[PDB]
């Protein structure tokens, strides 16, 4: 059920994200920033169990505040960069995720590394907001992002197969997927753009 319920939730959050992007282009800037802060707040709070309403709210908000990067890279490198990026994200998600659904060996150890990795990304990202890195650094940083988050997709579906995830845990667990998805998309899209 979990591999049928949680997945459905994830895809639903994808739909809501899409609506958030479509609406997001109409959303005036300077109001994007507090939505971003709200996004970080929801992330920190959820993983400090959040219900469906929380998840979908964050889905809409995240769907909105991703518009700047989307429109930027589309308007500098072509709409294809965005599309190819999206499809690529989809494929890596499907393949590596499926591997998560099949491979027996409990990938619970790497949880340490993975965490250390995301935190690392966070560090760089934080630094990046204050003192921006050159394109050369953005490329590397992006590649690392793609790797770490592909790993997080894999690991996540593996834990869906293994760990005693109660029914009620459905939303926040599906949220763990959505973040792993969105983050890959960005780091994979930005990769295509710099090229
Ligand atoms: Pt399944
Ligand atoms: Pt395996
Ligand atoms: Pt979990």
C-alpha 124 – ligand 3 centre gap (Å) = 25
DSSP of 59-108, one letter per residue?
HHHHHHHTHHHHHHHHHHH-HHHHHHHHHHHHHHHHHHHHHHHH--S-TT
User: What is the Cα–Cα distance from 119 to 116, expressed in whole angstroms?
Assistant: 5
How far away, in angstroms, is 93 Cα from ligand 2 center?
17
Hey, is 48 helix, strand or coil?
A: coil
* Dist. CA 5 → ligand 1 center (Å): 9
CA angle 115, 11, 172 (to 5 degrees): 40
Q: How was this structure determined?
A: X-ray
Phi, psi of 165 (to 5 degrees): -90, 110
CA distance 177 to 156: 7
| Integer angstrom CA distances of residue 10 from 54, 65, 77 | 13, 18, 29
Which residues does 181 contact at the CB level (< 8 Å), separation at least 6? 10, 14, 89, 93, 153
Whose atoms come closest to the Cα of 106: which ligand? Answer: 2
Q: How far is the CA of 118 from the centre of ligand 1 (A)?
A: 26
Q: What is the largest CA-CA distance in the chain?
A: 48
Please report, for residues 56, 59, 81, 104, 179, the alpha-carbon distance to residue 87 in angstroms, rounded to integers and kept in the order given: 23, 19, 10, 28, 17
Spatial separation of the C-alpha atoms in residues 101 and 156, rounded to whole Å: 9
**How far, in Å, CA of 191 to CA of 145, rounded?**
10
Residue with tokens 């599309």: 83
Q: Residue 85 — φ and ψ, nearest 5°?
A: -60, -50
Q: How far apart are CA 23 and CA 61, in angstroms?
A: 10
Residue 76 CA: distances (Å) to CA of 22, 72, 145, 155: 19, 6, 21, 34
Q: Give the Cα separation of 108 and 124 in Å (integer).
A: 25
What is the stated resolution of the deposited model, in angstroms?
3.6
Distance 128 CA to ligand 3 centre (A): 29
CA 73/CA 62 separation, integer angstroms:
17
Ligand in closest contact with the CA of 1: 1
**Helix, strand, coil: what percent of the chain each, to 5?**
85, 0, 15
| 157 CA from centroid of ligand 1 (Å) | 9
């Amino acid at each position: 059920s979990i591999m049928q319920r949680i997945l459905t939730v994830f895809v639903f959050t994808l739909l809501i994200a899409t609506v958030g992007l479509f609406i997001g282009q109409f959303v005036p800037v300077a109001l994007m920033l507090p939505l971003s802060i709200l996004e970080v707040a929801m992330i920190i709070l959820a993983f400090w169990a959040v219900g469906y309403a929380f998840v979908y709210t964050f889905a809409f908000v995240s769907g909105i505040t991703l518009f700047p990067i989307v429109s930027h890279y589309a308007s500098i490198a072509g709409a294809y960069v965005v599309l190819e990026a999206f499809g690529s994200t989809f494929v890596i998600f499907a393949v590596l995720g499926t591997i998560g659904a099949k491979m027996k060996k409990d990938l619970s150890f790497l949880w340490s590394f993975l965490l250390v990795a995301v935190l690392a990304l966070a560090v760089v990202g934080i630094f990046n907001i204050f003192s921006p890195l050159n394109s050369a650094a953005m490329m590397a940083y992006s590649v690392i992002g793609t790797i770490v988050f592909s790993l997080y997709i894999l690991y996540d579906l593996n834990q869906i197969k293994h760990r005693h995830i109660t029914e009620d845990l459905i939303p926040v667990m599906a949220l763990s997927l959505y973040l792993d998805f969105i983050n890959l998309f960005i780091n994979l899209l930005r990769f295509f753009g710099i090229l």
